[PDB]
């Protein structure tokens, strides 16, 4: 038992990480079949970053301007293309270590594992949520760009995130693997505000279920409440509204602990209005919102890859 | 920038995980060269667990009593041996995916990555400290045993932990890969005491350095203190004593932030005696002790594998 912030095994993704160089600029690429995916700002100097014309900069580039290294091996680029904010470099060799993969666009509150990379070499793996405002609280130094976020489904890697930049407060912004930013962000060095972030309510309830499952029960109360009553309180504390969809998603956990979703909502209400008053839940002194209901079941029932 | 609990890339360890079955009992094995390492309690029924004689139970077993699956493939056991609390099954095949590895025994406060496994299949990867009392706060269900903890050194996997059991309060106990328990624990189903745990002081100071590096500086003071002065306060809060060795280890971070170790010790003193007054440090509401000074530099300077 016990509850940890757990990332998926990075193996399948490690064998897709390559180094992409264009003049000065070197960052990380994702090699799937005979295609290498990287942020398009690989073609920029740090001067260009104030206001780049990516169309113009790319027109000036040819295949041999793009160096791709997969460990010690060099990959012959035989074509290049720009899809939104990612670059697609066609290469002579299909990746022998290509896993079964999809590209998916995750929704706010959904979580994924980041494999942080520098020079196409895996550095470390951690777990993230897409925040309500479409930022992520990641760990990224310079060179990290092209590092990707993913979920695993037995054998199938679903790629949801490629990292492009840091914002004010050093939160992070990036794209799906089709190169569309999450949120209103642009791959340009300007003033960009993320705007107010909210707590992922369905995730906090999942986490309280994880607590109860692990013997952390001090916060359970006699009260129940209406979905309506609860939301009126949640709005006040910058919690995202709880929907019938969220209640239906929390059902199996409801059923495994024998605590009605609206019973737990009543518990959460107390904690928001009264505070945790010095005490802890699964050793955290604040309410944790980066475990989905699927994360809690995966971990608490132990699904394997 | 930003600071996360980061595990090492699990790839090299995923290709060493196999499934070991002995009658009823199925748990995880580590396949390195032509040897599979697992907890010796694989040979126990839940009756034997109250008070096993492992010598006698093993005498009763032959090679064909041991089923080893590496994915879909079956491995012929051609010898079996007991080293303390691990079982060494000799097999016909050397592991083609064996990485460069050492076996090391870590010290209290040292951290490592756990690859949690069920039926020899990687489930998830997270970061742990060996607590002062030689427990770990992991996440382990039934079937998890034989899951291992490791650090990576560029290309070399150092294995330090194999998981054997849960204790009271659902903390976890295990062995090095030579089969010697960390702490006073035995592989037997009895009531076992971990005894008092202490906060890993050198790790909390490393973490405060990580904070300052990431713009979290509200807790800085002008004060300094003696090692002796500081320890007289630390003892009171069940913090491990800070040694000159700890001060010397914190030097590079000292140098990167330009804050003398004993200046930061004076900051920590304030936080213990005054509390955090409801504010946060790297988004934590308590003081974090599971980042080593090496962890903080790895992440904050971005070292690669
Ligand atoms: C990409 C790193 C890389 O490999 O690309 C160049 C080799 C980085 C990732 C950053 C670096 C620090 N932490 C991260 O998460 N992204 C950028 O550097 C982007 C590139 C683009 C497009 N970029 C460029 C220029 C400026 C900024 N950021 C800011 O202007 C800014 C403002 C505030 C406040 O904080 N940052 C940027 O992200
Ligand atoms: C090994 C799992 C495995 O793969 O082996 C079975 C095929 C488990 C790991 C445990 C299960 C729950 N969480 C874990 O970390 N280890 C055991 O089950 C060990 C076996 C040995 C040796 N074991 C056996 C019997 C009892 C206990 N538990 C306790 O002593 C205990 C007391 C209190 C309170 O909490 N736990 C045990 O770990």
Q: Which runs of consecutive H residues, i.e. helices, occur in chain B? A: 11-14, 54-59, 201-213, 227-236, 244-249, 251-257, 261-274, 293-297
In terms of phi and psi (left: phi > 0; alpha: psi -120 to 50; beta: otherwise), the region of A222 is alpha
Nearest-CA residue of chain A relative to B167?
Answer: A1
- Residue B41 CA: which ligand 2 atom is closest? 22
In angstroms, rounded to a whole number, what is the distance separating the alpha carbons of residues B122 and A17? 20
Any ligand 2 atom below 6 A from CB of B26: yes
Task: With beta carbons less than 8 A apart as the criterion, state whether A135 and A172 touch.
Answer: yes
CA separation, residue B88 to residues B34, B39, B98, B160, B188 (Å):
10, 9, 16, 16, 19
Beta bridge partners of B70: B73
- Residues 138-197 of chain A with CB under 8 A from chain B are 138-141, 143-144, 166, 170-172
For residue A102, count other CB atoms closer than 10 A to its CB: 13
Any ligand 2 atom below 6 A from CB of B118: no
Helix/strand/coil (H/E/C) assignment for every residue in A105-167:
CCCCCCEEEEEEEECCEEEEEEEEECCCCCCECCCCCCCCCCCEEEEEECCEEEEEEEEEEEC
Any ligand 2 atom below 6 A from CB of B172: yes
SS3 B270: helix
Size of interface A-B (CB pairs under 8 A): 148
Residue of A112, A88, A106, A50 whose CA lies nearest to A298: A112
Query: Integer distance in angstroms from the first to the last C-alpha of chain B?
Result: 19
- Test B138 with A2 for CB contact under 8 angstroms: yes
Determine the length of chain B.
305
Residue of B91, B95, B97 whose CA lies nearest to B75: B91
Q: Tokens in use for B137?
A: 């706060």
In angstroms, rounded to a whole number, what is the distance separating the alpha carbons of residues A123 and B297? 12
- Residues 50-109 of chain A with CB under 8 A from chain B are none
- Test B139 with A6 for CB contact under 8 angstroms: yes
Q: Tokens in use for B299?
A: 């992440």
Q: Is A131 an 8 Å CB contact of chain B?
A: no
Instruction: State the distance from the centre of ligand 2 to the C-alpha of B165, rounded, in angstroms.
Output: 4
Question: E strand or H helix at A90, and its extent?
Answer: strand A86-91
In angstroms, rounded to a whole number, what is the distance separating the alpha carbons of residues A242 and A200? 9
CA separation, residue B299 to residues A125, B7, B195, B276, B302 (Å):
11, 10, 32, 25, 5
Nearest-CA residue of chain A relative to B3?
Answer: A139
CA A177 to chain centre: 12
CA B199 to chain centre: 16
Smallest Cα distance from B60 to chain A, Å: 32
Beta bridge partners of A280: none
CA separation, residue A185 to residues A105, A112, A134, A291 (Å):
16, 20, 9, 25
Smallest Cα distance from B226 to chain A, Å: 30
Q: Which ligand is nearest to the CA of A45?
A: 1
Residue of A191, A188, A146, A190 whose CA lies nearest to A48: A188
Q: Specify the pairing of strand A67-70 against strand A73-75.
A: antiparallel
Any ligand 1 atom below 6 A from CB of A52: no
DSSP A98: P
Instruction: State the distance from the centre of ligand 2 to the C-alpha of B166, rounded, in angstroms.
Output: 5
Structural Rg of chain B based on CA atoms: 22
In chain A, the largest separation of any two C-alpha atoms, in whole Å, equals 69
For residue B154, count other CB atoms closer than 10 A to its CB: 9
Residue A215: list chain B partners with CB under 8 A: 170
Q: Tokens in use for A41?
A: 């700002």
In angstroms, rounded to a whole number, what is the distance separating the alpha carbons of residues A18 and A117? 9
In angstroms, rounded to a whole number, what is the distance separating the alpha carbons of residues A78 and A91? 5
Name the method of structure determination.
Answer: X-ray
Residue of A300, A232, A234 whose CA lies nearest to B123: A300
In angstroms, rounded to a whole number, what is the distance separating the alpha carbons of residues A239 and A233? 9
Contacts of B38 (CB under 8 A, 6+ apart): B20, B27, B28, B29, B30, B86, B87, B89, B145, B146, B162
In angstroms, rounded to a whole number, what is the distance separating the alpha carbons of residues B28 and B122? 10
In angstroms, rounded to a whole number, what is the distance separating the alpha carbons of residues B250 and B227? 13
Q: Tokens in use for B77?
A: 């056991």
CA B100 to chain centre: 20
DSSP A285: S
For residue B273, count other CB atoms closer than 10 A to its CB: 10
- Please provide the DSSP assignment of B275-296 as one string: --TT--BTTBSS------HHHH
Residue of A229, A227, A241 whose CA lies nearest to A273: A229
Of A4, A123, A298, the CB nearest to B304: A123
- Test A6 with B116 for CB contact under 8 angstroms: yes
Residue B299: list chain A partners with CB under 8 A: 124, 139
Q: B61 burial class (0-12, 13-18, 19+ CB within 10 angstroms)?
A: middle
Q: Tokens in use for B23?
A: 């009658």
For atom 25 of ligand 1, the residue with the nearest CA is: A189
CA separation, residue A273 to residues A116, A235, A267, A270, B26 (Å):
38, 12, 10, 5, 47
Q: Write out the catalytic residue numbers of B.
A: 41, 145
Q: Is A137 an 8 Å CB contact of chain B?
A: yes
Residue of A77, A97, A103, A121 whose CA lies nearest to A33: A97
A contact test, residue of B302, B303, B305 with most A CBs within 10 A = B302
- Residue B28 CA: which ligand 2 atom is closest? 4
CA separation, residue B60 to residues B19, B24, B44, B54, B57 (Å):
21, 15, 11, 10, 5
Q: Print burial letters for A211-240: b (CB count within 10 Å at least 16), e (below 16).
A: bbbbebeebbeeeebeeeebbebbeeeebb
In terms of phi and psi (left: phi > 0; alpha: psi -120 to 50; beta: otherwise), the region of A302 is left
- Residue A28 CA: which ligand 1 atom is closest? 4
In angstroms, rounded to a whole number, what is the distance separating the alpha carbons of residues A136 and A111? 10
Any ligand 2 atom below 6 A from CB of B187: yes
Q: Tokens in use for B207?
A: 């973490």
For residue B114, count other CB atoms closer than 10 A to its CB: 28
CA separation, residue A118 to residues A14, A161, B150, B173, B298 (Å):
12, 16, 21, 35, 12
Residue with tokens 């064909």: B64
Contacts of A236 (CB under 8 A, 6+ apart): A272
Q: Tokens in use for B83?
A: 């080293």
Query: Integer distance in angstroms from the first to the last C-alpha of chain A?
Result: 19
Strands in chain B per DSSP E: 17-22, 25-32, 35-39, 67-70, 73-75, 77-83, 86-91, 101-103, 111-118, 121-129, 148-153, 156-166, 172-175
Sign of the C-alpha dihedral computed for residues B237, B195, B295 and A145 taken in this order? negative
DSSP A65: G
What A231-236 contacts at long range (C-beta under 8 Å, 24+ apart), as own/partner pairs, is A233/A269, A233/A272, A233/A273, A234/A201, A234/A272, A236/A272
Any ligand 2 atom below 6 A from CB of B138: no
Of A6, A119, A286, the CB nearest to B304: A119
Instruction: State the distance from the centre of ligand 1 to the C-alpha of A144, rounded, in angstroms.
Output: 9
Residue B143: list chain A partners with CB under 8 A: 302
Any ligand 2 atom below 6 A from CB of B256: no
Any ligand 2 atom below 6 A from CB of B164: yes
Sign of the C-alpha dihedral computed for residues B3, B6, B8 and B14 taken in this order? negative
């Amino acid at each position: 038992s016990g509850f940890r912030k757990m990332a998926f095994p990075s193996g399948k993704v490690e064998g897709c990480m390559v180094q992409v160089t264009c003049g000065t600029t070197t960052l990380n690429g994702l090699w799937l079949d005979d295609v290498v995916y990287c942020p398009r700002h690989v073609i920029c100097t740090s001067e260009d970053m104030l206001n780049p014309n990516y169309e113009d900069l790319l027109i000036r580039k040819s295949n041999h301007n793009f160096l791709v290294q997969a460990g010690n091996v060099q990959l012959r680029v035989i074509g290049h293309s720009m899809q939104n904010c990612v670059l697609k470099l066609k290469v002579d060799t299909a990746n022998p270590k290509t896993p079964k993969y999809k590209f998916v666009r995750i929704q706010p509150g959904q979580t994924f594992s980041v494999l942080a990379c520098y020079n196409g070499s895996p550095s470390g793996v951690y777990q993230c949520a897409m925040r309500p405002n479409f930022t992520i609280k990641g760990s990224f130094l310079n060179g990290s760009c092209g590092s990707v976020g993913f979920n695993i489904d037995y054998d199938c890697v679903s790629f949801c995130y490629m990292h492009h930049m840091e914002l004010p407060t050093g939160v992070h912004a990036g794209t799906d693997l089709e190169g569309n930013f999450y949120g209103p962000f642009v791959d340009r060095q300007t003033a960009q505000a993320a705007g107010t972030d909210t707590t992922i309510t369905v995730n906090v309830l999942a986490w309280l279920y994880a607590a109860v499952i692990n013997g952390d029960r001090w916060f359970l109360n006699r009260f129940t409440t209406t979905l309506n009553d609860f939301n009126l309180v949640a709005m006040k504390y910058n919690y995202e509204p709880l929907t019938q969809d969220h209640v239906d998603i929390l059902g199996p956990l409801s059923a495994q602990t024998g605590i009605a979703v609206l019973d737990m909502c009543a518990s959460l209400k107390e904690l928001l209005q009264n505070g945790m008053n010095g005490r802890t839940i699964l050793g955290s002194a604040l309410l944790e919102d980066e475990f989905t209901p699927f994360d809690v079941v995966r971990q608490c029932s132990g699904v394997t890859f």
